[PDB]
Write a protein that binds this ligand. Structure first.
Ligand SMILES: CC(C)(COP(=O)(O)OP(=O)(O)OC[C@H]1O[C@@H](n2cnc3c(N)ncnc32)[C@H](O)[C@@H]1OP(=O)(O)O)[C@@H](O)C(=O)NCCC(=O)NCCS
Ligand SMILES: CC(C)(COP(=O)(O)OP(=O)(O)OC[C@H]1O[C@@H](n2cnc3c(N)ncnc32)[C@H](O)[C@@H]1OP(=O)(O)O)[C@@H](O)C(=O)NCCC(=O)NCCS
Ligand SMILES: CC(C)(COP(=O)(O)OP(=O)(O)OC[C@H]1O[C@@H](n2cnc3c(N)ncnc32)[C@H](O)[C@@H]1OP(=O)(O)O)[C@@H](O)C(=O)NCCC(=O)NCCS
Ligand SMILES: CC(C)(COP(=O)(O)OP(=O)(O)OC[C@H]1O[C@@H](n2cnc3c(N)ncnc32)[C@H](O)[C@@H]1OP(=O)(O)O)[C@@H](O)C(=O)NCCC(=O)NCCS
Lengths: 141, 140, 141, 140
């Protein structure tokens, strides 16, 4: 897919280049049922006015990666998956380079999957983490 | 200039090039205890399934709470930056606007905390964000 | 009930005085479907070794009050309610007196209710807050 | 003395009278990067429905993460205390033990952060706690 999001449907409401993810440049590298990775090159579109990666950008990258890692498994079982909680904590800022995210699945329940997502800079330092709780529900249409 | 608080003569990134400008965040009211902001839904704010992106609610809450703290503390020699953002999602938004209201609930020497509500065009509570804002002396 | 917890069943697995809540002295004052209050007199049983109310005590009081405020409504509809996330943030410590909690319902969905709980000292100051997310599920037995 | 780190000659509250002593928390391993603790389930740890109290997992995570920070920073003149505890609950515990393992993931000048896992007697992950620990100069 665009951004390499999992291809689980024949068509999507919004094309990759037009979504938030498309606009800021998020790209998924690996995806398996228990772990997924994605990254993004830092440009001003990712920053706040003070020149640092925007807090919302780490949240969004985590959210898309954990959500979609769940969608990759559950869609074909007739479920929808959507984030119900995103708790991101910020340890070190990023000014430039890339942000690289790794989502590790820690719980796969029938109604909720939980992913721990680490967000690292190009030196490998842990700049933020997000705890992503993803609701899983039967698709209604 | 998204109407962000004018606290400095120069900013490293212009509004229109920032994430906030790209998606269209605009601050309406700002006081030390309460601030509001809003955005029109466009595809730039959406994920590929046509709903407002989880990260969009987080980014709105984050810029609002953070810059409402900057508004007070910058002229006191302090830098303010988000240290935790906990957003929870109750109802999706497909189109219209998202409107945020940040209510300051704690203002301590090193941390300010804001409860942010994110509502749709019908006034319904779609999400909430608990924003924890670190306050530290500006590094010369 | 003991602690004035909502009386929704003819019998309970564990008596009030023997539970955590019983042991530390939590007591519910008001309960309605949208708001509930409870308090606790501070004694050493509530404190950590450094003499301050234990971080776990604020979490527990919030958790019981939001959970039970949900149970008060949903039990008689055949649902069980149990906390799925408790996010407590700590602003000011308490050394002695009481901790008073007020739970305000902010979302009542079919699977999740969400309560904002403020925890105040005897001077009325806001010492901690907890965001309580309560899963609601049909009872299995 | 729940085996908490011995960093001071006197403590305001004895172990047995603290919340930790009343419910039975005991620290096993403690190093600067990783600590473990456990408790036997008894009714004192339970809510009236017979399951381990939500607050019990939070209190375990909180004392473990906090005191693993005290272990390092106290002798450096610093006080450490929890500023946020985010616990999420995946599976209940009716009886047996709860075992916690705190892994330090960030150690900054003013905040240390610990990922705490809470497991049952079968090793299953029952809950997790993200502990944010504020570190400040001790007030003389
Ligand atoms: C919140 C929760 C109900 C959500 O369910 P989930 O994430 O979809 O997880 P699953 O439904 O896949 O099941 C996990 C376990 O939760 C419990 N559970 C789930 N639904 C339940 C229900 N309707 N009634 C009773 N227990 C239930 C069961 O113990 C289940 O184990 P089992 O499948 O061996 O019976 C579940 O995660 C949970 O019970 N969490 C623990 C809550 C807790 O312990 N809070 C602390 C205070 S008691
Ligand atoms: C986390 C914390 C230290 C961060 O400090 P802050 O947000 O900058 O808050 P302030 O520094 O403005 O001070 C608020 C109160 O915190 C306490 N505090 C702050 N710094 C302190 C320090 N270095 N030593 C002792 N107490 C301190 C004091 O009670 C202070 O009140 P006072 O200034 O009237 O004495 C402070 O919010 C706090 O103590 N939170 C509560 C911690 C808690 O109770 N945890 C649960 C287990 S005890
Ligand atoms: C997570 C969630 C599914 C849990 O459901 P809940 O707390 O039990 O709330 P309810 O089920 O009572 O319903 C609230 C709304 O959620 C949505 N929803 C719930 N279940 C759904 C499902 N199976 N399929 C699609 N939408 C659903 C619907 O919009 C619903 O409104 P409606 O009842 O008018 O259709 C729901 O809160 C939600 O969708 N949250 C918003 C998620 C979100 O917007 N994330 C941001 C990125 S898109
Ligand atoms: C929140 C925060 C300031 C708390 O500080 P802390 O936990 O004590 O961390 P430290 O103070 O040990 O410093 C870690 C990095 O934070 C930044 N920082 C800390 N204090 C700072 C200050 N007063 N001014 C500018 N940067 C500061 C520096 O990048 C520091 O790295 P360095 O010491 O190598 O320059 C720090 O963790 C931080 O900056 N977090 C990331 C904030 C973020 O990116 N938010 C998202 C929107 S920009």
């Amino acid at each position: 897919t665009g951004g390499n999001l999992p291809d689980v449907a024949s068509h999507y409401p919004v094309a990759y280049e037009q979504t938030l993810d498309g606009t800021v440049g998020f790209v998924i590298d690996e995806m398996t049922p228990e772990r997924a990775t994605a990254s993004v090159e830092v440009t001003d579109t990712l920053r706040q006015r003070w020149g640092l990666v925007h807090g919302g950008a780490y949240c969004a990258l985590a959210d898309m990666l954990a959500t979609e890692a769940t969608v990759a498994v559950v869609h074909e079982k007739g479920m929808m998956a959507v984030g119900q909680s995103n708790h991101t904590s910020f340890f070190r800022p990023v000014k430039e380079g890339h942000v690289r995210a790794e989502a590790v699945r820690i719980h796969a329940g029938s109604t909720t999957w939980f992913w721990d997502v680490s967000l690292r800079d190009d030196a490998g330092r842990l700049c933020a983490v997000s705890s992503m709780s993803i609701a899983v529900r039967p698709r209604r249409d």
